[PDB]
Every structure is written in structure tokens, then in C-alpha cells.
From a paper:
New World mammarenaviruses (NWMs) are enveloped zoonotic agents that can cause human hemorrhagic fevers; they include Machupo (MACV), Guanarito (GTOV), Sabia (SABV), Chapare (CHAV), and Junin ([name]) viruses. NWMs exist as quasispecies and contain a bisegmented, negative-sense, single-stranded RNA genome whose small (S) segment encodes for a nucleoprotein and a glycoprotein precursor polypeptide. That precursor is processed by the human peptidases SPase and subtilase SK1/S1P into three polypeptides: a stable signal peptide ([name]), a receptor-binding domain ([name]), and a membrane-associated domain ([name])6,7. Three copies of each non-covalently associate as part of a mature, 3-fold symmetric homotrimeric membrane integral glycoprotein complex ([name]) that alone decorates the surface of the NWM envelope.
Numbering used by the authors:
A (entry chain F), H (entry chain K), I (entry chain A): 2 to 58
B (entry chain L), F (entry chain B), G (entry chain G): 61 to 247
C (entry chain M), D (entry chain H), E (entry chain C): 252 to 258, 269 to 485
């Protein structure tokens, strides 16, 4: 719930070097976690089990 | 009240006065100053008016020289006026056994009610004058302080109808209660 | 009881000039449970005593409610009011217990404690001689709000738990790296295949005689 | 105004025996904005009133500055001075509002609030009967300095941001490990090559008839 | 000295109705080094003065220990006792400085400051009209204990150290991932082997003439 | 004392009273109220008993009308009784130069010692009655407040043996010390 | 001032006294004690010296027995001495209407100015002796307390030149201002 | 030492979503650290050096 | 800026087990991050692009 208030208050504490550093590291961590998981193959197994049996190729 | 900063606002709150005064369980004596000269003190049913000038309407030779509250019964026919006068003099500080007395009229005289005290800043009664100045300063917020250091200065208190425009302040009432010791408020 | 609340408190309509029910924040009101230098809270105590007075009066009791100088002296702070009158004597700003102002954070409803609007020469003080106060007041309000929101979660979780989590995380990272870099398992003969399971001994041979003890060179690897 | 500052304050030359301008720290001075049991701050209030007195006198005003017992009683703390005189009556240490000492941290300029150097039998107290105080005073000074430096950054960053960073970091580590260990993708026939793209179905075959449905054993691997 | 301790203090047997030596916690006792609205601490100050009185009496001194109204007025808080008598006049709960209760955390020995058990109509107050207090008292006791235990470690470690550790950890994780994903090193010719050490240049060739500059396609890989 | 919550307990501590009183370096005057009527004040060696009723045992015409503590020497032969009476009247508030006097017996009379004050809530002595009511309320925790507003009400104080069952309270002693100014406690 | 711990130092600050006294807007009465016996009180222009001994230089039969400040005008020709004496007696606590009077000389007599009070700890004036002892203790930090409990003890105050070596302490001045009520400091 | 008091007080702050989340992440981190280290092979080298020379296989 | 004051104050809080543990983990993290990055090959690509074209070997 306080996340929405954080978005509302974003242009108040954004004038701090540590704040931008923390938000940047959080964003890069989230995005590379997503890309790394896509490199892992869980959704690859999802499409594998979806394709299992229905199609030869 | 206006926006200050980026999400904050500046606004003020003002407290009522007539409700607090009309709502107290007892009746409070209230002091007031109207225009720039006229001082007023209202007790239970005594709406006394106080002024300062170098006019001597009373003389020690032919008057009553009140020294004790017991003699005050010889001045007015109503007990409320006696109570108000005695307690006002007690609040300003007039311990009745070591100070000069103050002058009033015999009640049977056909000239109303009035009491007056001399506070001229001269050789004699200089200490009393300074003590009364301090008491007046403490019992009235913005004291005009008439009758500056000079020839003569006498304060007079007379009974008049209570004007319906006095700002019912409460700081002066608090100081009156603080200075006055063992003051008993009726009702 | 009287004003010693332990945690909101609203000011009724007849108490305010605007004649509207105005709830003050409980956290802000609770600030002066020990303060003796806040005229706003002195007025609050006076009004609470008056409220108890109407409660008694309409309850039709026989309480001997004496009103005298000592009672009011005990209610309000004598030292503070005497200091105010002293500041009145010399021509410096003071306030006659009637006007108070505060900085309000309109998004979360949190507000600062209302100070006293100082007066001088039968007039109020405008923004020209007063701007240096509300800026730091608002800054301190924001800082206090952030600190309180942090302390709310702070005072409900154990330090040992977070310390355990931190040490577990650092060990997790260390072991992850240990897996990642890879550590060689066994020795292969240079130029040959994996000797497992009949693996060469310290001096490059076997005690069963199948692998000659020739002190052949070995390289440590992970796989076969 | 008077000593109710809201945040430094220096003591002028004529006020100190050494006759030198000595700036005290603002944070330390602001400590006794509510303390009523600090003789040093009582002397500070007295000297501030005197300073305002010279300001008025050299401003050539008509202020009726009455000096009486009640004024000084309102300025200093009657209870504290009465307690000091009580402690004077029975032969126990006290201090006559003239000598104060403090522990100074010379690297950052932070200093403790100056306490009162207790006296006895018309003599001061030496280190033999006083060493138990300044050690804990210095320890508390260091602790307070560290706590203040922490709280300075503490009251300017949001808890939600650091919580988001922590959870993002733990998810990052988890996904990194998930990449590292490796998860098998598809099934290869034991003893054969990769069937992709014409890959075997659940029962080990194909619906198109190219790969017989022989229920051949399969092993899950990542690569081809 | 008197009750201005800077950090436990126990109540002797003759002081308590149970006639047993009861040590109160030092942290809880130190709470009212500035509180003026705690009847328990007023009684504590009275008993400390009495204790110093027996010390003087059995020391056989000549101290002129005057006992008068002003002394007792200086010892106890006049305002608090006057407020208690005021609350006695109107029929509302009060306490006559004799019964105190507290919430005790029996595992760590930490206890709350003993409040005053209010009375009414010559009788005590039972749990029916009093249950709303001790629940929040215990909750605040637990919160205060957790906050104090956290602050104990908090005020002994530097913020710069933990910040350095956090940044080092995030860099460690980033570099670990950088190792894990792998970054291609050099270009191999599509359909051929590794050209190293005689490796092809930008336009797919060599300046020495061994490898023709045919702009052959290249793929970036890590290994050979 | 019982378990509250899951690990916390609720228990109380009660402070002793006889030790504190018997342990003070001086001798303290203690006030008490037994049954619902009998008021008691014990000083150094004066164990005075106070009651209220509309019985007039003393008259102004044939008595000693004490106005000053100097005349109090004409009532009792022991200085402790004089000290107790004077300081009790000072504590309740009886500034001897502006108030009605109070009546006692000549010492040579063979009828013991007793002093009485009239506090009937009538026209005269109404202010004194209210002041004494406030003093009694401040100097006694649960004041029975006998002799309600009506015909007459007189308080009498007589010397009796000190009963060995009074609850030795200390709030009343604190109020006696606070109200009484410049009270000197012996021993 | 020396190094304590590893980075911290211990140093002290001492406040000046002559600047504060010479810098006050008004003139403050200052009390002092020199050697181990000689007590001194300096007001506006009255530099009074106080000593204690069992020498009776004044007698009630042939003197002026001052009971009120009004009679004090019959002792000295300068108002400052009258002010100092009256306010010192008020500060120590001598409410003039319930206490024994004190003795002085007629002004026309050719023997200077002096006032003396007897405080011997005997049967009569024991309470006054104890009250004066408490006042002296409160108004002087390290009171020598001469004339111990015995035959006689009389305090004398005489006008002498102000010695230029008194430690200008300020605790005693604060206590003088606190004890003295409604004291008006000139200039 | 405070760890034992933590075990004693476990069913007091366990009624907090963040608390259970933190204890769960700590436990899963510890267990997968142990299993990952067992996948690394330090104890494999322990058994290797134990088996070194004594047995051909 | 406060880092220099930290170096100045190092032999004051160094008498704490948690402090030495934290400084040791920070130092080991930094050094193994550097060595791991050197194992990654970014500087290897630096020397690769430096050697690109100028030398056959
Ligand atoms: C209130 O107090 C003032 C104080 O000034 C009284 O006025 C003063 O009255 C006395 C009466 O004896 C005057 O004294 C005489 O005055 C002249 C010289 O000034 C001369 O006849 C004598 O040598 C003697 O000193 C005194 O001067 C006079 N004050 C002034 C400034 O003129 C006033 O009468 C008092 N009011 C009442 C109603 O009692
Ligand atoms: C001292 O406190 C009093 C209240 O006890 C303040 O009085 C306020 O004075 C202002 C004028 O400065 C009043 O405003 C005027 O009021 C009426 C409203 O009908 C009207 O004459 C004008 O339109 C104007 O608004 C204000 O009402 C009044 N407040 C109260 C509660 O009575 C006073 O300002 C304080 N003293 C000083 C020196 O400021
Ligand atoms: C009470 O406070 C007073 C100040 O109001 C303290 O007086 C101080 O007394 C010391 C001696 O103990 C004085 O030191 C001496 O001063 C002069 C300097 O020329 C000289 O005689 C000696 O060389 C020596 O330094 C000190 O100056 C004085 N301070 C002041 C500010 O006057 C007094 O110590 C306090 N009372 C007690 C019992 O300590
Ligand atoms: C005002 O404080 C006093 C103490 O100064 C409290 O007196 C206490 O009163 C209770 C009864 O409510 C006494 O309990 C009884 O005591 C004796 C013990 O032998 C006996 O009669 C009974 O068995 C019963 O336990 C209690 O002892 C007494 N406390 C003290 C210390 O004397 C009083 O309760 C307070 N006022 C009010 C209105 O509660
Ligand atoms: C203590 O004070 C009471 C106050 O009531 C004294 O009783 C009052 O005595 C006076 C004596 O003059 C009575 O005044 C006279 O009463 C009647 C009418 O009531 C009549 O003879 C006269 O017109 C005059 O007013 C007064 O009434 C009486 N009060 C009551 C309520 O009867 C009482 O004597 C005093 N006690 C002592 C021991 O002095
Ligand atoms: C200041 O007070 C002292 C208090 O002692 C006065 O001395 C006392 O003077 C009275 C005069 O009547 C002495 O009383 C008589 O003394 C003897 C027996 O002691 C005898 O003649 C009589 O029976 C009567 O009691 C009293 O004793 C004496 N005190 C002492 C201790 O000798 C002193 O005179 C007063 N000073 C001034 C200047 O008034
Ligand atoms: C109020 O709005 C609730 C705030 C909750 C914040 C949770 C943050 C979760 C972070 C997202 C991680 C996503 C991983 C795939
Ligand atoms: C008091 O009991 C001391 C508490 C110490 C807690 C240390 C926690 C250590 C975490 C275990 C990590 C195990 C890694 C293999
Ligand atoms: C004042 O001196 C500024 C303090 C800044 C400290 C920054 C710490 C950075 C940690 C180094 C990481 C290096 C990674 C290669
Ligand atoms: C007093 O004030 C009233 C109200 O404004 C005004 O009518 C009247 O003239 C004033 N009187 C004097 C004497 O100033
Ligand atoms: C007028 O009142 C005074 C004041 O007591 C009094 O002395 C005088 O006798 C009264 N006059 C008459 C005629 O009664
Ligand atoms: C602050 O302003 C908001 C605006 O909606 C208001 O609701 C709130 O009550 C204010 N806070 C106060 C008066 O404390
Ligand atoms: C006070 O205000 C009045 C007008 O209301 C003005 O004439 C006067 O000069 C002011 N005084 C001061 C000291 O500012
Ligand atoms: C205060 O200053 C502002 C500046 O804009 C001005 O508008 C306002 O009138 C001033 N107030 C007073 C009372 O002089
Ligand atoms: C502490 O000592 C240093 C030494 O340089 C000094 O500069 C500083 O002012 C002192 N701190 C004080 C007096 O508060
Ligand atoms: C006080 O000091 C003096 C010397 O200045 C000494 O003679 C005396 O014994 C001391 N008294 C006490 C009680 O220590
Ligand atoms: C205090 O003790 C120290 C110990 O070294 C000594 O040098 C000093 O003289 C003592 N001071 C006094 C006043 O006795
Ligand atoms: C709380 O209870 C425990 C039970 O063992 C006891 O030891 C402890 O003293 C109590 N705490 C107090 C009285 O502060
Ligand atoms: C007080 O208690 C008594 C019994 O002790 C009872 O009769 C009386 O009604 C009670 N009064 C009130 C006001 O509760
Ligand atoms: C308080 O309420 C409880 C409820 O169980 C009851 O047992 C107890 O007697 C009550 N106490 C009084 C004094 O009425
Ligand atoms: C006073 O109380 C005592 C003790 O309970 C009792 O014996 C006696 O009868 C009571 N007296 C009256 C008049 O109530
Ligand atoms: C009785 O004592 C009084 C009170 O002073 C006194 O006036 C009267 O003379 C005494 N009686 C006798 C016979 O001495
Ligand atoms: C008083 O002290 C001074 C200054 O030290 C000295 O000269 C003089 O002799 C002393 N007098 C007495 C009587 O002790
Ligand atoms: C001496 O002064 C006294 C004190 O009032 C006075 O009674 C007496 O008459 C004066 N002597 C002469 C000769 O005037």
C-alpha cells in the first residue's frame, strides 16, 4: 500500500545521490533477473510441455 | 494558508474566547482597556471604570481614610462593590497594614460612590508609585501609563455601565487570578 | 481525567472561531504530555478542565469545585506566562494565547504541533520577518514522518533475525561462487584419459600393479 | 527573543574568564531547550537576558524593564537552586554556578554538555573522587555521535526503497543460482543423439510415424 | 547526592510493605531523571532524602538540617500534588501516593515504570474499568525492549562500514553474474577452427599474408 | 498479580508508611480522620481532636478574644499546645490582622482547654466560612463537611488522648507542610 | 585539561563574574563574607557590616523600638539606609506586625547609626532565633553561625566603608532576590 | 547467546508476514547453500584424499 | 569524505568482533570480485582490440 504513496512522493526525495543509486541498482537487478531467468529455461520447459505430443516438430 | 514546499501547506487555527468565558462554571472578573485611555474592571456585578489624571476630587481632611476592609462597609451599600474594590486592591498589592491608606466617601453623602489613590512620582509615595506602576503593568497587557513623572497623578475608580464592545481578553484575567491570593470567585 | 493521555483528540465546534469540529492528530497532540513551554497545550488543558466542568454540572453532582488563584496557577504554567509578560514589557515579539499556526502535510494528514504566532505593537507578524521558521518546520516535519514510519517497522522485528538473514545471504553468495568457478576433482595423466575408477596414487601408480609407478605427470581436473 | 532556540551560539569574550570568543556547538546548546536541571543553561539564560538588556539600553527605548524578585525567580529555576542550597546545608557536594567541565572530541569538534564541577568544604573535587563520571561521559559522547551520524542519513531515505532493493537483490541471487546449476531442457534417447526438432512425445514416439512409439528410455538434458 | 543518577537502584526492606529487598531495574529507574509527573518517583526522591538523613544522623555531624514547608515543597512536585487534590475534589479517579503497579517481562527481567493505581470513593479500581491500560503498556514494553536491544548494537558500529559492505556485496554479485553468463573472447571463422594465435584482423585477414583478407564471416566465442 | 499476554506478568508494589514516618529526622505533624466524623491533628505533644456542630460553648462577652499569638499565652500553660494551635490556624489561613478573631478560655479557669471558631454560612462571616471550607478541603483528603448551609455551625478543638488506630496517611501531612508557611518542625 | 581515552580531551570553562554584575541594567544588592567572621551587605549606597556577639549596646528603655517602617524615618537622615535596612529585614523574614520589634537610635543623638537584634537561643525568642538562623543560612552560603546556643547572642549592623576585596558572588544575590518579595532595585 | 532467547520468543513475533518471509528465505538460503557446496566437491576432495593410495579403485 | 575520518578512527571501533568480521568480508568480497572479473575477460577484450590488426599473432 505504501508503494503507491512512494510513487506519489517520488519527486521529493529523488534529489539524493544515494536514492538514485539505489533505484538504479534495484531496476537493473530486476531487469537482469528477468532476462537471466529467461536464459534459464523455465518458460522453455513451459513451451516444451505445451508442444509435447501435439506436434512432431 | 497557502502551499509551502511541494506537498505541504501552511494554515493557522484561532481559538474562540466568548465560549470559554461564558462556559466557565464560575463568574470570572475580566479586565479591559478601551480606546487608548479608558480602563475597565468587571467583577460579579460591579463594572468599575478607572481613569488617571491630576484632578483631586477627594481630600484627607473631609473623607473616610480606609485602612482596613472592615471600614469599607462605610462607603457603599452593596456588598459586591466592596468585594470588588477590596480584591482589586489586594491583587495589585496593597497589604493594608504597611502602606498609606486610601480615601473614599461616606455612604450617606449624596454624591454617589468613588475611590481614588494618589500615585504621583514625588519624594514621598515614590515607592508606592513604583509598586502601583508594576502592578498596573502586570494587570494590564498594553498599559498606557498616563500621568508621567511630574507634578501630580491621581487614579480614580467610579461605577459606570459596562460597555458592550470590550475585547474579552483572557491573559489579563489569568494575571488577575495569579496576583490575587485567596480570591474567591462566586457562582 | 485531565490532560495526561497515553495515546484522535478533537477540538469541538464551540471552541474554535470557525465553529467546526476539527480533529487534531493523536500523535501530534500526544507530543506535549510533558512539555511545559507550549501555550497551545496550556489552552488545551484549560479547555479540558472546562469540559470536565460542564460534565460535572450536567451530571448534577455535589462536588466542591473551588475556583481560586491557586487552581488556575496549577492549571497553566506560571513560568511560561510570566516569561511572556516579561517579553511583553520590553518591545520584543510575544503572543497572547489566541492565534496558532502549523505546517500541514496534506497527503498523509500528518501535521506539526501548532506554535504561537508572535505579535508586536498591537499587530501580527507577517511573512517578511517570519519566513525563516516554517521552512525548517516543514523540513523537520518530513524528517519526523520518515523516522516514525521507519521506527514503526523497526520496533516489531528482531535484530537477530535480520543478522541471520544477512549471514545466510553472504554464505549463499560465497557458495554460489564456489560452484561457479569450479574446483578440480581428480588428476588425469597428461596426454591420457581419465584413470577412474582405477585411479593413480600419490607417486603416480597403483598398489595393485595395473598402473606402473612411473611418477607420470598429472593435471587436476573436474570432469572425466 | 529569549532562550528557546530551534536551531552556533557563542559566548562572548566579556562573559568568559579567559576573555576569548568561544563558540559552543549548536547541537549541544540546543540540548537544554526543555531541561530545567542544568545550572550551565540557567547561567546561559541569565546572560541572554543581560544581552537583551544592553540591546535595549543602547537602543534608547522607553521599556519599563522592572527588576524584582519575581523576574529573577522566573528566569532561573527556583527548584534547582533550592535543591543546591539544600545539598549545601548537609555536607555533600554542590556547585555555586561558576565552574563547568565537559569532554571534547577534538577530531570532529563535537563536545558534551558542560556539567557542574561539584565543590565541598570551600574546595573543588579532584580526580580521585570524580573519575567515575567522565569515562562514561566520553563513552556516551561517542555513542551519541555515532547515533546522530546514523540518524542523519536515516531520516532522509525511505524504508520502502531499501526494502525493494533487498528483495530485488535476493531475487537476483536466486535467479543467478538458477542459471548456474542448470535445468534440463529436453529428453534425449539413451544411447542416441538429440531428436530435435522431430522430438519424441510422452510415450517415446511421434504422431507422424517417423519415430516409432517404442517407449524408449529418455534422459533429460540441457544441450543437444 | 540526590536523585539525579546518570546510570541497579534497589528499595530496601523497611521501605516496602512486603519487607523484602527488591531491586528495580536501572534502566527503568533512570527513566524519571527529568520526569515531574510520576508520583512513584516523587516517593523515591522522598525516600532518598530520608536515607541521606539517616546517613547524616548516624555519621554524627553538625549539619543544620532545617525541615520546613519550603523544603518538602522543593522535594516533591507541588504542581502534581495540587493536580491530584484537584482531581480529588471533583469525583474522578486519583491516587494517594501509596499503591503502584507495573507490567513485568519475566524472561529478561525488564519491567515498565510503575504507574499509580487510581482510586475512587475510598476504594481501588478493578480490572473492569482498567483493562484498557495494561494491554498497551505491555505492548509498549515489548516494543521498547526490542528498540533498546537494536539500538545497543546500533550505537557501536559505523554507518560507513555497513555501506561499504553493502556496495562490496552488490559488486560481488554483479561480477559473479558477469563470470556466469560468459562474454565471448575472440572470433572464429564460421565453419572453421580457432585462428589463434595467428588470428584474423578487422577485415577478416592478416597483415603477414598467411590468412587471406577475404572478409570471411566471424562468430564471437569464448573458447577455442 | 497474574499472567497477561504470553510472557508478561502484571504485579504491583505497595510502599510502607510507618517506617517513613518513624524514620524522618524531625517530628512531623500528622492529620487523620476516624470513623466518618472525628478529625484529629497530632503535633509534637498536642493530640488535638476537632468536631463540628451547632453548639455554642463559648461567648464573646465572657472569654478571651484572641487576635494575636501573643495573647495565646493567656490560654494554656504548655507551649506545645500554643504552637500547635497557632500553626494550625496559620496553615488553614488566618492572617491575624485582617480576619475576625477567635475565642478561648482564661487559663486560670477550672474548665480545661478548648478553642472554637464559628463558620456558619450566613450573611456575615460568609467569606470566612468559604475560606475555612477551602482550607479544610485542602488539609483533609475526604472532608465530611458537616454543618451544611443553614442556621449555625461551630467547630471545636479540644485535647484528647491520641487513638492508636488512625491510618497514618502522608498526603495530608504534605498539604499541611505546603499550606503552612515558615513552619518549624522540632527534633 | 588533558587527554582522556584515545581521541577525547577533558577541559573546563569558567564564567566571569565582574562583567555580569557591572553589566546588569539595574544595581543589585550583593552579600559577602570576608575572613571567617565579617558579614557584609551592599545595597545602592549603604555598605552595611554585620557582626555577632554577646555585647548589648542598645536597651529597650532608652531607644526607639522600631515596629513599622514608618518609624524608621526617625533613625537615619538618608533614605538609602532606611531602604536597605527595611528590605534586608523583609528578606530575612520579619513580617512587622507579628514579631518582636527591633531597636535603634534617635537620629539627633550624636552616636552615628546602628541597629541590633537579639537572637539568643533561650526560652523566649527561641522561635525568632530559629527563624533568623534559617534566614541567615539561606542568605549566606557558608554561614559561620557564631553565638552558639548559650547565654546571649546579639547581631549588630553598622555602616562602614565597602572593602575592595569581597568575592562578588552571585548565588547569595539570587537568594536575596528570591526571599525578598516585591523588592524594587533602583537604576 | 541471544539466539536461545530468540528460540524461546519464536511464538511471539511469528505473527508477522515479514517475519515468516525472512525466516523462510534464511532457511532456504542455508539449505541450498549446503546442497550447492555438496555439489561443489570439497567433501569430494576429502574422500579423494582419503581414498588416495589405499585402494586402486 | 567520511571515509578518511573512518581511516582516522579505525583503531577505536576495531575492538569489536562484528567490526572485524564485516571488514574482513568486505575486503574478501572486493578482492575476489576483482579476481573474478579478471577471470571474466573484459580486460582480455581490451588487449584483444588493442592487438587487433597490428600483429598477426
Ligand atoms: C498624593 O501624594 C502627593 C505627593 O506629591 C501629594 O502632594 C504633596 O502634598 C504635600 C502636602 O504636604 C506637599 O508637601 C508640601 O509641599 C510644598 C512644597 O512642595 C510645601 O508646602 C511644603 O514644604 C511641603 O513639602 C507636596 O509638595 C505635594 N507634592 C507635590 C508634587 O506638590 C498629594 O497631596 C497626595 N494626594 C492626596 C489626595 O492625599
Ligand atoms: C489578543 O487576543 C485577542 C483575542 O483575545 C485578539 O483579538 C483579535 O483582534 C483582531 C484585530 O486585530 C480581531 O479582528 C477583528 O474582529 C472583528 C470580527 O468581527 C472585526 O472588528 C474585524 O473584522 C476583525 O476581524 C479579532 O476578532 C480578535 N480576536 C478575538 C478572538 O477576539 C488580539 O489580536 C490579540 N492581541 C494582539 C495585540 O494581536
Ligand atoms: C564560588 O564561586 C566563586 C566565584 O563566584 C569562586 O571563586 C573562585 O575562587 C578561587 C579560589 O578557590 C579563585 O582563585 C583565585 O583567584 C585569584 C585570581 O587573581 C587569586 O587570588 C588566586 O590566584 C586564585 O586563582 C577564583 O578566582 C574565584 N573565581 C571567581 C570567578 O571569582 C569559588 O571558588 C566558588 N566557591 C567555592 C567554595 O569553590
Ligand atoms: C491512602 O493510602 C493509605 C495508606 O497511606 C491506604 O490505606 C490502606 O487501606 C487498606 C484498606 O483499603 C488497608 O488494608 C487493610 O489493612 C490492614 C492490614 O492489617 C487490615 O485492616 C486489613 O486486612 C486490610 O488489609 C491497607 O493496609 C492500607 N495501607 C497502608 C499502607 O496503610 C488507602 O487505601 C489509600 N486510600 C484509599 C482511598 O484507598
Ligand atoms: C458566628 O457567626 C454567626 C453568624 O450567623 C453568629 O450568629 C449570628 O449572631 C448575630 C448576633 O448579632 C445575629 O444577628 C442578629 O440576629 C437576629 C436576626 O437573625 C436579630 O436579633 C438581629 O437583627 C441581628 O441580625 C445573627 O442572626 C446570627 N446568625 C444566625 C444565623 O442566627 C454567631 O453568634 C457567631 N458565633 C460566635 C460564637 O460569635
Ligand atoms: C534578647 O533576648 C534575650 C533572651 O534571653 C534577653 O535576655 C533575657 O532578658 C530577660 C529580661 O526579663 C531575662 O529574664 C529574667 O532573667 C532572670 C533569670 O534568667 C530573672 O531576673 C527573671 O526571672 C527573668 O527570667 C532573661 O533571663 C534573659 N535571658 C538570659 C539568657 O539571661 C535579652 O535581654 C534581649 N535583648 C534585648 C536587647 O532586649
Ligand atoms: C503497498 O502498495 C505494498 C507494497 C509492496 C511492495 C512489494 C515489492 C515487490 C518487488 C517486486 C519483485 C518482482 C520479482 C519478479
Ligand atoms: C547466541 O546464542 C549467539 C548467536 C549467534 C548466531 C550465529 C548465526 C550463524 C548462522 C549459521 C550459518 C551456518 C553456515 C553453514
Ligand atoms: C568520503 O571520503 C567518501 C566515501 C565514499 C565511499 C565509497 C566506497 C566505495 C567502495 C569501493 C568499491 C570498488 C569496486 C571496484
Ligand atoms: C471610544 O471608542 C468608541 C468606539 O470606537 C468611540 O465611539 C468613542 O468615541 C471613543 N471615545 C474616546 C474618548 O476616544
Ligand atoms: C459617614 O461615614 C463615616 C465613615 O465611617 C463615619 O465616620 C461618619 O460618622 C458618617 N457620617 C454620619 C453623619 O453618620
Ligand atoms: C491537512 O489538510 C488536509 C487537507 O485535506 C485536511 O484534511 C487535514 O485535516 C489537515 N490536517 C490537520 C488539520 O491536522
Ligand atoms: C504601532 O502602530 C501604530 C499604528 O497602529 C503606529 O503609529 C506606531 O508607530 C507603531 N509603533 C511601533 C513602535 O512600531
Ligand atoms: C508583510 O509583508 C507583506 C509582503 O508582501 C505585505 O504584503 C504585508 O502587508 C505585510 N504585513 C504587515 C502587517 O505589514
Ligand atoms: C575541542 O577542541 C578543539 C581542538 O582544536 C577545539 O577547536 C574545539 O573548539 C573544542 N570544542 C569545543 C570547545 O566545544
Ligand atoms: C576544610 O578545609 C580546611 C582547610 O581549608 C580544613 O582545616 C578542614 O578540616 C576542612 N574541613 C572538612 C570538613 O573537610
Ligand atoms: C586530588 O588527587 C590528586 C591525585 O594525584 C592530587 O594530586 C591532588 O592534589 C588532589 N587534590 C586535592 C584538592 O586534594
Ligand atoms: C519480574 O519477575 C521475575 C520473575 O522471576 C522477577 O525475578 C523480577 O524481579 C521481576 N522484575 C521486576 C520486579 O522488576
Ligand atoms: C462509596 O462506597 C460506599 C460503601 O463504602 C457506598 O455506600 C457509596 O454509595 C459509594 N459512593 C459512590 C459515590 O460510589
Ligand atoms: C471488579 O470486577 C471484578 C470482575 O470479575 C470483580 O470480581 C471485582 O469484585 C470488582 N471489584 C470491585 C471493587 O467491585
Ligand atoms: C469509631 O471507630 C471505632 C473503631 O472501629 C469504633 O469502635 C467506634 O465505635 C467508632 N465511634 C463512632 C462514634 O462511630
Ligand atoms: C484571665 O485571662 C484573661 C486573658 O488575658 C485576662 O484578661 C484576665 O485578667 C485573666 N483573669 C484573671 C483573674 O487574672
Ligand atoms: C581580614 O582579611 C584581610 C585580607 O586578608 C586581612 O588583612 C585581615 O587581617 C583580616 N582580618 C581579620 C580580623 O581576620
Ligand atoms: C528621638 O527620636 C525618637 C524616635 O521617634 C523620638 O521619639 C524623640 O522625640 C526624638 N528626640 C527628640 C529630642 O526629638
Amino acid at each position: 500500500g505504501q508503494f503507491i504513496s512512494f510513487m506519489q512522493e517520488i519527486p521529493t526525495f529523488l534529489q539524493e545521490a544515494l536514492n538514485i543509486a539505489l533505484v538504479a541498482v534495484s531496476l537493473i537487478a530486476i531487469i537482469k533477473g528477468v532476462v537471466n531467468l529467461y536464459k534459464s529455461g523455465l518458460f522453455q520447459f513451459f513451451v516444451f510441455l505445451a508442444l509435447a505430443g501435439r506436434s512432431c516438430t | 494558508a497557502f502551499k509551502i514546499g511541494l506537498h505541504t501547506e501552511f494554515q493557522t487555527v484561532s481559538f474562540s474566547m466568548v465560549g470559554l468565558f461564558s462556559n466557565n462554571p464560575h463568574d470570572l472578573p475580566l479586565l479591559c482597556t478601551l480606546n487608548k485611555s479608558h480602563l475597565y474592571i468587571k467583577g460579579g456585578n460591579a463594572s468599575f471604570k478607572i481613569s488617571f489624571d491630576d484632578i483631586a476630587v477627594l481630600l484627607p481632611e473631609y473623607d473616610v481614610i480606609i485602612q482596613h476592609p472592615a471600614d469599607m462597609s462605610w462607603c457603599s451599600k452593596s456588598d459586591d462593590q466592596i468585594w470588588l474594590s477590596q480584591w482589586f486592591m489586594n491583587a495589585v498589592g496593597h497589604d493594608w497594614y504597611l502602606d498609606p491608606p486610601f480615601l473614599c466617601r461616606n455612604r450617606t453623602k449624596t454624591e454617589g460612590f468613588i475611590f481614588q489613590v494618589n500615585t504621583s512620582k514625588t519624594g514621598i509615595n515614590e515607592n508606592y508609585a513604583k509598586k502601583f506602576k508594576t502592578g498596573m503593568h502586570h494587570l494590564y497587557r498594553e498599559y498606557p501609563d498616563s500621568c508621567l513623572d511630574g507634578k501630580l497623578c491621581l487614579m480614580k475608580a467610579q461605577p459606570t455601565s459596562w460597555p458592550l464592545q470590550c475585547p474579552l481578553d483572557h491573559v489579563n484575567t489569568l494575571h488577575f487570578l495569579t496576583r490575587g491570593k485567596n480570591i474567591q470567585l462566586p457562582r | 481525567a485531565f490532560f495526561s493521555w497515553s495515546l484522535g483528540y478533537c477540538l469541538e465546534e464551540w471552541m474554535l472561531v470557525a465553529a467546526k469540529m476539527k480533529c487534531f492528530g493523536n500523535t501530534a497532540v500526544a507530543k506535549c504530555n510533558l512539555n511545559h513551554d507550549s501555550e497551545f497545550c496550556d489552552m488545551l488543558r484549560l479547555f479540558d478542565y472546562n469540559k470536565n466542568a460542564i460534565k460535572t454540572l450536567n451530571d448534577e453532582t455535589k462536588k466542591q469545585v473551588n475556583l481560586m488563584g491557586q487552581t488556575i496557577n496549577a492549571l497553566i504554567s506560571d513560568n511560561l506566562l510570566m516569561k511572556n509578560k516579561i517579553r511583553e514589557l520590553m518591545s520584543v515579539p510575544y503572543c497572547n494565547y489566541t492565534k496558532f499556526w502549523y505546517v500541514n502535510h496534506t497527503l498523509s494528514g500528518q501535521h506539526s504541533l501548532p506554535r504561537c504566532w508572535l505579535i508586536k505593537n498591537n499587530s501580527y507578524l507577517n511573512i517578511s520577518d517570519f519566513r525563516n521558521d516554517w521552512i525548517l518546520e516543514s523540513d523537520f516535519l518530513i524528517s519526523e514522518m520518515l523516522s516514525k514510519e521507519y521506527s514503526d517497522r523497526q520496533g516489531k522485528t528482531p535484530l537477530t533475525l535480520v543478522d541471520i538473514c544477512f549471514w545466510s545471504t553472504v554464505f549463499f553468495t560465497a557458495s554460489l561462487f564456489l560452484h561457479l568457478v569450479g574446483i578440480p576433482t581428480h588428476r588425469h595423466i597428461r596426454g591420457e584419459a581419465c584413470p577412474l575408477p582405477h585411479r593413480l596414487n600419490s607417486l603416480g601408480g597403483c598398489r595393485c600393479g595395473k598402473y606402473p609407478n612411473l611418477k607420470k605427470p598429472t593435471v587436476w581436473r573436474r570432469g572425466h
